[PDB]
Every structure is written in structure tokens, then in C-alpha cells.
Amino acid sequence: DMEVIELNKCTSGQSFEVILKPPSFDRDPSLEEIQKKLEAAEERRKYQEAELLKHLAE
Amino acid sequence: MYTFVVRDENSSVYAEVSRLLLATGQWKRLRKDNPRFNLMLGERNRLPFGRLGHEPGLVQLVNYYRGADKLCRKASLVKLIKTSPELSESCTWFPESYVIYPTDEREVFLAAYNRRREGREGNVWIAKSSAGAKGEGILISSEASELLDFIDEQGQVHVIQKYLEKPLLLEPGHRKFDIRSWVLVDHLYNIYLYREGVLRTSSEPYNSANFQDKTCHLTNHCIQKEYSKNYGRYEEGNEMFFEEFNQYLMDALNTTLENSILLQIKHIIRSCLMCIEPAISTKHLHYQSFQLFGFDFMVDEELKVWLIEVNGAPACAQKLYAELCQGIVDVAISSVFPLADQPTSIFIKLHHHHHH
Amino acid sequence: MRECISIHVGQAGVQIGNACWELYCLEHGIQPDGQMPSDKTIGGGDDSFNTFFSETGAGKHVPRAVFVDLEPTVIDEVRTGTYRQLFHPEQLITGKEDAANNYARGHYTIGKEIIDLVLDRIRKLADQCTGLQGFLVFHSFGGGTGSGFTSLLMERLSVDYGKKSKLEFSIYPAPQVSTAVVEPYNSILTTHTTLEHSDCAFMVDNEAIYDICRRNLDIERPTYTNLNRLISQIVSSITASLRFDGALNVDLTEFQTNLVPYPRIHFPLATYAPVISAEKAYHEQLSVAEITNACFEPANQMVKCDPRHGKYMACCLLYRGDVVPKDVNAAIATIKTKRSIQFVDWCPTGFKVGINYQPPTVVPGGDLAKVQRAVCMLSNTTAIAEAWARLDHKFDLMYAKRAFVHWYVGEGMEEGEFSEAREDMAALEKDYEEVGVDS
Amino acid sequence: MREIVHIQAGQCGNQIGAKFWEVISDEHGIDPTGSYHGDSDLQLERINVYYNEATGNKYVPRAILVDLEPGTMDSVRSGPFGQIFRPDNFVFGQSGAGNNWAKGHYTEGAELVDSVLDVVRKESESCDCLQGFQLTHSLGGGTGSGMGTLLISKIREEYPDRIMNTFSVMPSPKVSDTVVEPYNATLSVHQLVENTDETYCIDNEALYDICFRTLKLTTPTYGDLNHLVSATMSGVTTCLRFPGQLNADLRKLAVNMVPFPRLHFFMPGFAPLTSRGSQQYRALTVPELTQQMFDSKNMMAACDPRHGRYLTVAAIFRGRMSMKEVDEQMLNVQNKNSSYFVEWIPNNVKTAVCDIPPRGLKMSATFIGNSTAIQELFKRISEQFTAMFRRKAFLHWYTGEGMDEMEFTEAESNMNDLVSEYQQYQDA
Ligand SMILES: Nc1nc2c(ncn2[C@@H]2O[C@H](COP(=O)(O)OP(=O)(O)OP(=O)(O)O)[C@@H](O)[C@H]2O)c(=O)[nH]1
Numbered sequence A: 001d002m003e004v005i006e007l008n009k010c011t012s013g014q015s016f017e018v019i020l021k022p023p024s025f026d027r028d029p030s031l032e033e034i035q036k037k038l039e040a041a042e043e044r045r046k047y048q049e050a051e052l053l054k055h056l057a058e
Numbered sequence B: 001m002y003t004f005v006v007r008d009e010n011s012s013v014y015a016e017v018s019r020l021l022l023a024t025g026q027w028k029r030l031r032k033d034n035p036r037f038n039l040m041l042g043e044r045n046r047l048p049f050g051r052l053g054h055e056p057g058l059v060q061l062v063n064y065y066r067g068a069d070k071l072c073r074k075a076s077l078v079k080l081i082k083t084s085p086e087l088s089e090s091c092t093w094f095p096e097s098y099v100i101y102p103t104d105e106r107e108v109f110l111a112a113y114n115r116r117r118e119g120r121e122g123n124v125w126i127a128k129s130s131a132g133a134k135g136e137g138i139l140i141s142s143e144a145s146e147l148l149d150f151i152d153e154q155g156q157v158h159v160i161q162k163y164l165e166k167p168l169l170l171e172p173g174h175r176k177f178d179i180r181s182w183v184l185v186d187h188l189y190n191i192y193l194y195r196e197g198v199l200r201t202s203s204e205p206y207n208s209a210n211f212q213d214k215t216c217h218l219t220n221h222c223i224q225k226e227y228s229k230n231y232g233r234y235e236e237g238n239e240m241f242f243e244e245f246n247q248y249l250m251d252a253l254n255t256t257l258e259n260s261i262l263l264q265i266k267h268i269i270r271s272c273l274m275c276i277e278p279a280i281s282t283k284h285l286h287y288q289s290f291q292l293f294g295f296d297f298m299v300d301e302e303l304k305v306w307l308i309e310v311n312g313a314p315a316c317a318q319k320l321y322a323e324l325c326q327g328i329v330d331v332a333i334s335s336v337f338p339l340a341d342q343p344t345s346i347f348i349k350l351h352h353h354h355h356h
Numbered sequence C: 001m002r003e004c005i006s007i008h009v010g011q012a013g014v015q016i017g018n019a020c021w022e023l024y025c026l027e028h029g030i031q032p033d034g035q036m037p038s039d040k041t042i043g044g045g046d047d048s049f050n051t052f053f054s055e056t057g058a059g060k061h062v063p064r065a066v067f068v069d070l071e072p073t074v075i076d077e078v079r080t081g082t083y084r085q086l087f088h089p090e091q092l093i094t095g096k097e098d099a100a101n102n103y104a105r106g107h108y109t110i111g112k113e114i115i116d117l118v119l120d121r122i123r124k125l126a127d128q129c130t131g132l133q134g135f136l137v138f139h140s141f142g143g144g145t146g147s148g149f150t151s152l153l154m155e156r157l158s159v160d161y162g163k164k165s166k167l168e169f170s171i172y173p174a175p176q177v178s179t180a181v182v183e184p185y186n187s188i189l190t191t192h193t194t195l196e197h198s199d200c201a202f203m204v205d206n207e208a209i210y211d212i213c214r215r216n217l218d219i220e221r222p223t224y225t226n227l228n229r230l231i232s233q234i235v236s237s238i239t240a241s242l243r244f245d246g247a248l249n250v251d252l253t254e255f256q257t258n259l260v261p262y263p264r265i266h267f268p269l270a271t272y273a274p275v276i277s278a279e280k281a282y283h284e285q286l287s288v289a290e291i292t293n294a295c296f297e298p299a300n301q302m303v304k305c306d307p308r309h310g311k312y313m314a315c316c317l318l319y320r321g322d323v324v325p326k327d328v329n330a331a332i333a334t335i336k337t338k339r340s341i342q343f344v345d346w347c348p349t350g351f352k353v354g355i356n357y358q359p360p361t362v363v364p365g366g367d368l369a370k371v372q373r374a375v376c377m378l379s380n381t382t383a384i385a386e387a388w389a390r391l392d393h394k395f396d397l398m399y400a401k402r403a404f405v406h407w408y409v410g411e412g413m414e415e416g417e418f419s420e421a422r423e424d425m426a427a428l429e430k431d432y433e434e435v436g437v438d439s
Numbered sequence D: 001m002r003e004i005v006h007i008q009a010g011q012c013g014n015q016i017g018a019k020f021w022e023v024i025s026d027e028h029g030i031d032p033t034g035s036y037h038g039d040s041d042l043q044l045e046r047i048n049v050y051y052n053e054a055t056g057n058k059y060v061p062r063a064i065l066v067d068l069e070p071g072t073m074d075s076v077r078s079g080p081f082g083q084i085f086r087p088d089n090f091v092f093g094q095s096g097a098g099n100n101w102a103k104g105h106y107t108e109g110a111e112l113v114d115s116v117l118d119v120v121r122k123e124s125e126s127c128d129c130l131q132g133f134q135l136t137h138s139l140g141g142g143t144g145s146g147m148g149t150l151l152i153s154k155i156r157e158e159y160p161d162r163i164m165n166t167f168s169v170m171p172s173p174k175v176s177d178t179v180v181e182p183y184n185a186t187l188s189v190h191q192l193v194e195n196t197d198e199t200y201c202i203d204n205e206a207l208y209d210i211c212f213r214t215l216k217l218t219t220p221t222y223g224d225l226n227h228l229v230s231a232t233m234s235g236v237t238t239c240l241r242f243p244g245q246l247n248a249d250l251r252k253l254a255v256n257m258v259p260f261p262r263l264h265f266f267m268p269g270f271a272p273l274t275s276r277g278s279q280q281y282r283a284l285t286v287p288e289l290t291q292q293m294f295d296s297k298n299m300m301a302a303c304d305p306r307h308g309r310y311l312t313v314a315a316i317f318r319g320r321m322s323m324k325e326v327d328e329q330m331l332n333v334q335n336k337n338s339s340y341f342v343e344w345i346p347n348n349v350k351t352a353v354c355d356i357p358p359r360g361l362k363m364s365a366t367f368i369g370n371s372t373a374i375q376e377l378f379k380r381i382s383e384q385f386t387a388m389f390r391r392k393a394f395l396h397w398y399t400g401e402g403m404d405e406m407e408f409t410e411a412e413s414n415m416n417d418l419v420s421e422y423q424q425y426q427d428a
């Protein structure tokens, strides 16, 4: 039992669907939120770098 | 040096395989979670089959067949037998069974039960969960009104199955038994039946009507040692081995074990494992599986064998550990990982190729 | 006709892109200079191949392609190689120092300084499109650029082109050819951050391709050239429907419709057959039945996993060469009796089939023999979650000791992102468990 | 990421540094006048990593030669490849440092350090993309130890986002100039733990033991020791210098080798072990290379790797050989000795191959291990230190230059913390 469905042909090929059984039963963040995350990370870098340069000054 | 890891501390069989492997001096045990093993002797639950066979430079082998639980849970065993054309609804060696929940078969179970209500001939069944196995959660009853209420009084899924009203009874005793056969399936899907089986004997005479004598009706080892006053009378540990059971069959019934029982057992084993081979085989796979099974059989008055259960993680009987575990190493482990440098095999190979 | 822009990020993405465009050119009869004699509409057109190639007044056929790497050496080989003329310099974008195998360095540190340039070069190609349909993004999971920059790029593409479809070709890390120990970290970080931005993603495990190249091409030690030519054959199979006439998978939206009913579960398994060595003197050509049956062997999959122990949500068969429906249906019937093909209960058990009569083109002098018929199966099976379980377990091992974590924190990333990313993967593994398994 | 700026400081620093430039100049086809007379194009594809290109297509080492005494640097000018170096990069005082860390770091060295930094800046400004720095020095003297670590501190201040790499020669009573070496070493180790990304621990104890026990040299000279150093240095910089499937740089090396920032001290190894003017007629097989390179007898740090666990490993095979056979052998080592590789860093051994072998060998292997057994090196120095420090012996040489006992106590403590830290990951 194999029903052949929506057969489409053309010069370069053909396509179709074969069914063996039917179905057995029945936030993307803004430009601003991205900038306020890259910038936040850059601040954490600058902080870490300033702390190093404070230590080297001592 | 080959390497292995041990992830089931409670396995008596693989405890002994571990010892035997170390004692060769060509197998080192690694820590549980070191991924650089040749052999995994694995946990019973959530064995991480998806992590096997992705370590370059290591052939990896495991002592379980992924998907073998379709055979080894009672509910799924019944689904497998009913729906597979290799083992039809008319399959002659499995007791008539129905799966039942607190998908479901209650109304098809009653439809065959009403053939027996219009029947003068036998309505005793049994009800069981796939793993409530402490000796408990087993009801025998002449009618469904006690069963279906009992199944809902316990939490999990259950199977209702025909009770073999007329079993074969060993004399002296007028008593019940089941047969345990140990089957090793290797990485090439060779089916190896161990030559020694064992009868788990009841030690109490059989039957009343008020069944409740989990001792004469249920032949589990734990149930005999606790509830049976006659534990150890006729054979020690309530365990009759094949030399004695053969001899009894020759003396009492004029047949052999081979002819009367083992042909049917070999047939059943082979039919079960060849059914599931395409779903579990590791023939062209990136890791390899072997597994030891315990098939449990009943014999009736007619010397007809019936399959009760398949155990995916069996224990051995105490006398036989040495021999079986050495055979697992030779056939299942050293076949893949050969050691350096008159044999008669302890297994019988199940193959049979009839033309039609 | 609706155009598709290809984006190649990092070493893996760029080298696989090279392989694909080399192949595409050979398939469409486009020479290295960009001339296509068989194209008789000089200076433009809306043919199916114009999905992937724009045209110039002088008859040059130019890929709708952007190459992005944070160091110049790999894209410099494109700038100086056999297909140097093919691409416009503005398509080939390079930085000076790479991400050092560090996701955080590719995403936050070095990513921030080049992201606005890349989007501007992407916008230049989008302005030449009458009906931009979306993007094909090629990258590694394991590289710092492949992982870090890609996830940033994908976030922005959703902002600037919210109605367009985005497909990935993603190389999943394999220790046998990887140069980095932190690839599990990188892989999970980029999967977490990319997951909502990708409509459909084809994972290729370098382990699978490496071993296919070993067993079937008789190559002792496969190079990236070997791996990439095989991958491009597969990528070409998947994209054929967009660059050729037909009625199956004609548009990026259809990949999602046909392969992805549950949006987060958007990782179809590719399986491809036959792979046959060009040095093999006597080859018995394989039939429709034999190659279709080959689509159900794990040894031919792009990820080693076991489809018998999961469930299918969709299956597409893409044939190239001498194939007619009758043979396919007879093959499928035979295959369903012998094999364990369990679908989920809420989908039809069935196959969408696409046939293109041109047999696969092989690169002259390559490792793959010509064959009269080949097939690529795309099946969305829960068995691909095995790869996630392998990757997550490796991540758990390292992250439990915080090993290498300081390298990421030091680029401005916070430790919580590890556990947040790992939690999403625990949810992903559970989604696959729900769909694919019973009690 | 292409240019590396090399610095060599003190007697030991400049003797091994000179030998390094000799050896890689010959490997890259470059002669004592700086003219390329080689045959392979691989010898120049990444020549810019170590060399500047000048007029007439001369190649000039990106190398700064530093000392507080002129002696050893005048010996470098006189030496075979002495004319290759840029004359403006010789930066030297007159006083010397008297094997005194305090003089190198606080008094004599401060006076000279700014002029060294001018030359560093001059070299850094010319760099299209500076990877960072490599320093050769001993930790047991005064200049390489004291001034070399002062320099490292200053360079980090001015180039905080560049990689700092050292080849640091550790003192040993078997090859000992003075009794204060454990003081100079302990003071230097503190510095290296804070201010380097990766340090090659080259242990004079190990180099001696190799010369005595293995190479059969009854009386090892500094030249015999430095033959082992120069071979190891060539080896470990292979993937920085030569094109292959792994085009490495100092950051990628750091990211992949260092799981915790303080544990960045590597144990180098080399195979086959040769003495100068060798009779290497038998080329090693890939199994032999692999077995030897992991052997403790081939380690340049006097530690038993079986007393710890490998966090990470890098391996460089050189010569024409089977990459399949290399992969197999490398996999065999890990699978056969798996307890010694921490399970919590999966796939922690990575391997590269380069077709060009070093001079005098058909095949060689170089080992770079980050093992927890390196704590043995640090315990040894710490025990030597404490034996003197508990009686404040020889401290007046340091208090005379303005140092306080407290600074010694802190250095002892930090080095013992380092040891405890290695021990923490040996048990886990
Ligand atoms: N199949 C294939 N995999 C590759 C190729 N190049 C790299 N890889 C894999 O990609 C991973 C490393 O990431 P790359 O893409 O090289 O890194 P990148 O994106 O350039 O990032 P950085 O160099 O870290 O800035 C490893 O698992 C490699 O095996 C390739 O050409 N083909």
C-alpha cells in the first residue's frame, strides 16, 4: 500500500511524495540589546585591564 | 594490553568475568569514567550507547545489545509477539497475554474472557508488572473482577497472561518447576545456548483453589527460601540440573530432555532472537554488542514448552559461574580481542537454514 | 526567481565554500573566469542558477557569496587561487588576528570590530536582489571564528533581515583532525546563541567524513581537501533544488516545511551514497535499490548514530542521475519490510522524493569516481541527539573543573553564559527524548 | 599574528639564545651574513616570524641581546653567527649583577631597563602583527633572573594584550655557580607565575643527568648542556616557524596548553638524545621516537611524569615518515597509559608533523608536556631555599640592595601555593 502523490515532471527531472501510512494520531533580540551586551563585555575587559595596570603601578 | 571498565558493581556474572580477564594478565581495568576502553561491562539503566565507538584507535565492545529490552520487559515482549508476523497472534508457544494500564487491551482481554464465561474449560490467569520482581505483585485469580481492581491498586503497567492450569509435575512431590536457559548472543549474532540449564523447583505439593501459596505456584528462588518449609528436600537450593532431569525423564516418562523439551526451547530462543535481529544487530555499526540472556520456560503435562520471560541481566546458578563466565570470555570477548600464544564448546550454536 | 546569499565563516567555512563553488561552477558549465557560454541571456536573467550567481554586463557569473575570516591566510588562497577572478574583492573579507580557538574572542572581542563591515558587504549583495530569500551559513562549531563570529552574525541577520530564512552547514568537532581542546565549549556556546536564529542546520561530523574517506576512498590519512570535496558533493545535493528546475525544495522556506515541523529540532541527518574511489579499476555500478538501501546504513551518514533507536519526523530522498519513480517505489517497499523505520505518531510515514537526471559531477583529478546514479537522504531523526549527548558530556567533563574558562572570562564573557548555554542543551536533549522515546 | 620579538638576558640567556639563532638560521637556510642560500620554499614562507627583512633581501633576527656585563655579549659578536644581529639591539651595562636578583631587578637593572625597552618598542613598531615575546634567561643568576623578570613586568605594562613566553633555565647544585641560586630562582618563579603565559622549564639538573647517564659524558660542560637546549628550542618552535596543517602561534599554544592561568610551566622532551659530533647512522622508527619522547630520561625537567598527570601535551614529529604510523603510535601511548592523562580534558594530546628534520637527524620528535609532576621541580628549589632561609643565610647580599626579608617570605609562599595547586589537579 503506497500512494504516489503530487507527481511533477520537467526536462531536468521529476519529484513526488510517497505515503506508506497516514499520521497514526491526530524573542529575537533588537539591535540595541545586542549592542548592550557587546559593550557590557568590553567594560568587563577594560575593568580587568585597569586592575592589572593598577597592580603593576603598585 | 586490552582495557575494560566496570559500570555494574552488582553483576555476579561480570564480577567473575572481570576476575577472569584480570587473571589473564592481558586485560587492565580502568576507572568507571575513562573513555579509552576496549570493553564496557555496562550499567543496567541509561547505558550511554551513544558515546560508544567514537574513540579513534580503539575497537569498542559492550555486553548489552541496545534495543534488547523489547524482548526483556513483559509488556513489550507481548507487543513484540502480537505485532511481528514472524511470531503471529497464533504463536503456539507463548501464553495468551494482554497489556493493561492504570495502547491498552482491557476490552479485547474481556472478549476472550467471555469465550471462557461461555466455556466449561479453564479461566485461571496471572497478572504481573515487568519489574515489580521482589517475589510480590503477582495475583492468580479465577476472574477479572479481582485482577483489574488489583492492577489499579498498584502504580505501574501490568500484563495479564494465561495461567498454565495443568503443568508437568515432578514426582516424588507433585510439584512445579520452571527452566532457565542461558543464551549468549555474540557480536556476529551467533546464538549460543549454554548446555547446562537449571530447573527452579517448587518444594510444596501443587494446588488447592485458594491459590495463595506462593511456594507451590510461584517457583522464584527468593520465594522458596523464605515461605517454603520444605526448601532443600529433594535437591539442594531447589535446583535440579540436566543430568538428573534427563534421568528422571528417561525413568518416569521414557523420553529424553533433548527430544521432549530442548528442541522446543532451541526453537523458541532462535525465533525470538532472529525476530529482533534487524533492530539490534551491530554488524555494520561503529561499536559492537554481545549479551547474555536468561530465557525462562514452563513445561506442561503434554511435554509442551511455553516461554514465560526473557531476562536481559540474568544471574547464574552458583555451581555454573566458573564454566559460563569462562565461555563468555572465550566466545564473546576473546573473539574480538584475541589473546597471545582438545576443545569441546560449552555452547550449542543455534543456526538452522531450511529451504522453502 | 528568488536569490540566496552564501556566507562562509572561518577556515572550515571558507575551505568548504571553495569546494562548493568549484563544484557549482562545474555543474552549471561556468568557467574559472566567470563566463558561462550556455547562458544566452547575456547581462542578466531569472533562471534557476541565478539564485546563486549574479551577472555582469560582460557576461561574468559571480557568486552571491561572502567569505569572512579573522585572519587572512585562508581567504588569501581564494584571492590568489584558480577561482580568483570569480569573486569580487569586496566579497572576500579578512581581519589580521584570529580568535585563537576562543568563542568569546570571536564573538565579543574581535567580532565587535568587524561585524558592521561584514553586514555592509552582505547589504551590498542584498541590494542586487529582486527577491532576497535568505542565507546559507557555512562554518565550524570548533573554531573561535566559526563559533564566535557566526553566532554574532546570525543575531544581526535576524535584526536586519527578520523575514528571511537562514540555513547552516555546520562542521561538528572530531578530535582526529581538530587542533583545539576547547571545541566542546565553543560548539555549545555557538549552538546556544545560534539556535533561535537558524531555521534548519545540516551537521557534518568530521569523524564520519574522515572514516567514509578511509573505508570507501582507500585514503590512509584524509586531508581537508579530501573531506571538503566529499562534503561539497553533499552540499550540492542539498542545494541542487534551488539551482535547478524542479518542484521539491525550490525555496529555503520549503526546507523548513519539509524537514522541520518542531522549530528547535532543526538538525536533519544527511546520508549519501555511493562513495566510490576513482582509482578503483573495476566498479560494478550500483542500482536504485542498492543506493537507497545504503541511505539506512550508519556508515554512510554525516553523523554516526543509530536511526533504529529513535523516530523520524521527515524524510527526503534527493536522487541525481539515472533514476525513475518506479525503481524508487520498488526500492522503498523492499526497504520498509527489512528495516526499522518508525515515524512519530503525529507525522505521516512517507518520503518526499526529488530526482534530477544530470548525474553527479566530480571534480577532475579528485578522489570520487563518476557514477550513473546517486542519492542524498535528508531525514529528521531523533537519533542525531546522540551527537549532542557526546558533545555535552565532553563539555561537562571540562567545565566541572572550570578548565580553560579563564580564557573566555578574560575576553569579557561571564561564567554564567557557560551554564546558561549548557542548560539550553539539556533542554534540547530532553526535547529529543520527549519526541523520540517511550517509557 | 606573525612577528615574535626575541630577548636574551644574562650569560645563560645569551649563550642559549645565540645557539638558538645559530640552529634555526641553519634550518631556514640563512648564513652568518644574513643571505638566504637554501633550496626549499618552506624555509621562507614564515621566516618573518623570527626575522626582519632588510635591504639587499638580508634577514635580520628580531632579537634583542641584554646584559649588565659586556663579556658574554662580546663573545656573541665574536661567535660564528655574531654578525647577523642588528648592532643597535646590543644593550649592555658595565657593573654586572654579581649573581644577585636584587641587583638585576631593583638597582643595577633599573638603570638599564628603559634603554632595553626603547629597542623593544623599535622592533614592535615595525611589526605588522606582533604575537608577543620570547625570553631566554636563567633563574639562578642576577641579570637573566632579576633584570629578565623586571623586563617581563615592564613589557606586560606596555603590551598587556601580547603573549609572554620564556625559556627559563632552572638552577641545580650539580651545575652550580653560587649558593644563592635557590634564592634567585624562587624570586624569579613568583614573577613568572604572575607575568608569563607559557614557560619552558629547562632544568640544568636534567640536562646534566642526560649528559652523564645517557650520553656517557663524564664531565658535561655548558656546551654539552646547551646542545640539548638548542635542539629542544628548535623543536618547540617548529610549528611557529614552518608551514604545515597546524600553523600555530603563541596564543593558540597558550589557549590549548594552559587550563588554569598559573599552571603554565611546561616540561619539554626530545628524541633521539644526541651529543655533539654524534654517530647517528641509524634513523629511529616512529615507535622508537614515540616511546623515547615520552620517556622520563628524555625530559628536560628533572621530574618523573609517572608521579603526576598530564593536563595537556603537544608533540612535534620532524622528518619524512608515515603520518598514519605517527597517529597510531600517538594513539597507542594514550590508550596504553591512560591513567596519566586527566580524563577531564578530553583529547588532550595534539600532534603536528613537519617534513624538514633538524640538522644531523633523519627523524626527530619534540615533547611539550603540561604535567602536574613539575611540582617536583618547584619542591626541590623550595627545599634548597628553606635550608638557607630558616637561618637567613646569605641574605645580607640582598638587604644591601634595599630588599626586606618579607619579600622572601612572600616568594616562598607563592611558590608553595603553586605546588599545592599542581597537587590539587593530580588527585582530581
Ligand atoms: N571538514 C573540515 N573541517 C575543518 C576544516 N578546517 C577546519 N576544520 C575543523 O574546524 C575546527 C577548527 O575550526 P576552524 O574553522 O579551523 O577555526 P576558525 O573558524 O578559523 O577560528 P579561529 O582560527 O579559532 O579564529 C576543527 O574541528 C577542524 O577539524 C576544513 O577545511 N574542513
Ligand SMILES: Nc1ncnc2c1ncn2[C@@H]1O[C@H](COP(=O)(O)OP(=O)(O)CP(=O)(O)O)[C@@H](O)[C@H]1O
Pocket: B095, B126, B128, B133, B134, B135, B161, B162, B163, B164, B165, B176, B177, B178, B200, B217, B218, B219, B220, B296, B298, B308, B309, B311
Ligand atoms: N503463565 C504462567 N502459568 C503458570 N505459572 C507461571 C506462569 N508465569 C509464571 N509462572 C510462575 O511464576 C514464576 C515466574 O514469575 P516471573 O515471570 O514474574 O519471574 P520474576 O520476574 O519474578 C523473577 P525472574 O526474572 O528471575 O524469572 C515461575 O517460576 C513460574 O513457576
Ligand SMILES: Nc1nc2c(ncn2[C@@H]2O[C@H](COP(=O)(O)OP(=O)(O)O)[C@@H](O)[C@H]2O)c(=O)[nH]1
Pocket: D009, D010, D011, D012, D013, D015, D016, D097, D098, D099, D100, D137, D138, D139, D140, D141, D142, D143, D144, D145, D169, D170, D171, D172, D175, D176, D177, D181, D204, D207, D222, D223, D225, D226, D229
Ligand atoms: N644550561 C646552561 N646554564 C647556564 C649557562 N650559563 C649559566 N648557567 C646557569 O645559569 C645560572 C647562573 O646565571 P647566569 O646566566 O650566569 O647569570 P647572569 O649573567 O647574571 O644572568 C646558574 O644556575 C648556571 O648553572 C649555560 O650556558 N647553559
Ligand SMILES: COc1ccc2c(c1)NC(=O)CN2c1nc(Cl)nc2ncccc12
Pocket: C179, C180, C181, D236, D237, D239, D240, D246, D247, D248, D249, D250, D252, D253, D256, D257, D312, D313, D314, D315, D316, D347, D348, D349, D350, D351, D352
Ligand atoms: C591540546 O593540545 C594542544 C597543544 C598545542 C597546540 C594545540 C593543541 N593547538 C594549536 O593551535 C597550537 N598548538 C601547538 N602549538 C605549537 Cl607552537 N606547537 C605545537 N606543536 C605540536 C602540537 C601542537 C602545537
Ligand SMILES: [Ca+2]
Pocket: C039, C040, C041, C042, C043, C044, C045, C046, C047, C055
Ligand atoms: Ca542569463
Ligand SMILES: [Ca+2]
Pocket: A028, C158, C162, C196, C197, C198
Ligand atoms: Ca528568525
Ligand SMILES: [Ca+2]
Pocket: D111
Ligand atoms: Ca650606577
Ligand SMILES: [Cl-]
Pocket: C160, C161, C162, C163, C164
Ligand atoms: Cl526582512
Ligand SMILES: [Mg+2]
Pocket: B130, B131, B133, B309, B311
Ligand atoms: Mg524480571
Ligand SMILES: [Mg+2]
Pocket: B178, B296, B308, B309
Ligand atoms: Mg521467571
Ligand SMILES: [Mg+2]
Pocket: C010, C011, C071, C098, C143, C145
Ligand atoms: Mg582560523
Ligand SMILES: [Mg+2]
Pocket: D011, D141, D177
Ligand atoms: Mg655566570
